């Protein structure tokens, strides 16, 4: 009944869509799901790892910052310093109050 934002990442490219999807309760993709209605924006471009992201929603723009480094810690976040360079800036123009992450599963159970 309102618009939404969808950023997924398959094996090569990244696709971002601001259509009017109707979402299932357990969305994932198997080792897949996206609707298409009234779609107003689209953009396609190109435990030893740690990848950090910052999302902001300012004045009809979506801002993403990113940095990745190799770690070798047991299970925590490291006690060093590193700064996050800017990545992309998208003119989506929507309202965002909730979010949810996606996972790459093995056994498809559309619960």
């Amino acid at each position: 009944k309102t618009q939404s934002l969808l950023i997924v990442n398959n094996a090569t490219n990244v696709v971002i869509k601001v259509c009017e999807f109707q979402f299932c309760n357990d969305p994932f993709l198997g080792v897949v799901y996206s609707s298409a209605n009234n779609c107003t924006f689209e953009y396609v471009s190109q435990f030893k790892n740690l990848r950090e992201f910052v999302f902001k929603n300012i004045d009809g723009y979506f801002k993403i910052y990113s940095k990745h480094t190799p770690i070798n810690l047991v299970r925590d976040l490291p006690q060093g310093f590193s700064a996050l360079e800017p990545l992309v800036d998208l003119p989506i123009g929507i309202n965002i109050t909730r979010f949810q992450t996606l996972l790459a599963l093995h056994r498809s159970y559309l619960t």
């Binding site: 009944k1 618009q3 009809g60």
Partner: protein, 49 residues
């Protein structure tokens, strides 16, 4: 009509029904529950304005 105002550089597309009081019009356009969209009616007869 709308609930609150708009932020800068956002747009709101939603086919909903906006009620004025305590009565929850669930898909009904009866009393105090109206359609939020309205046409203009541009004629070549109309004065500038």
């Amino acid at each position: 009509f709308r609930k609150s105002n708009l932020k800068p550089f956002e747009r709101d597309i939603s086919t909903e029904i906006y009620q004025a009081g305590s009565t929850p019009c669930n898909g009904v356009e009866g009393f105090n529950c109206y359609f939020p969209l309205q046409s203009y009616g541009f004629q070549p007869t109309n004065g500038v304005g």
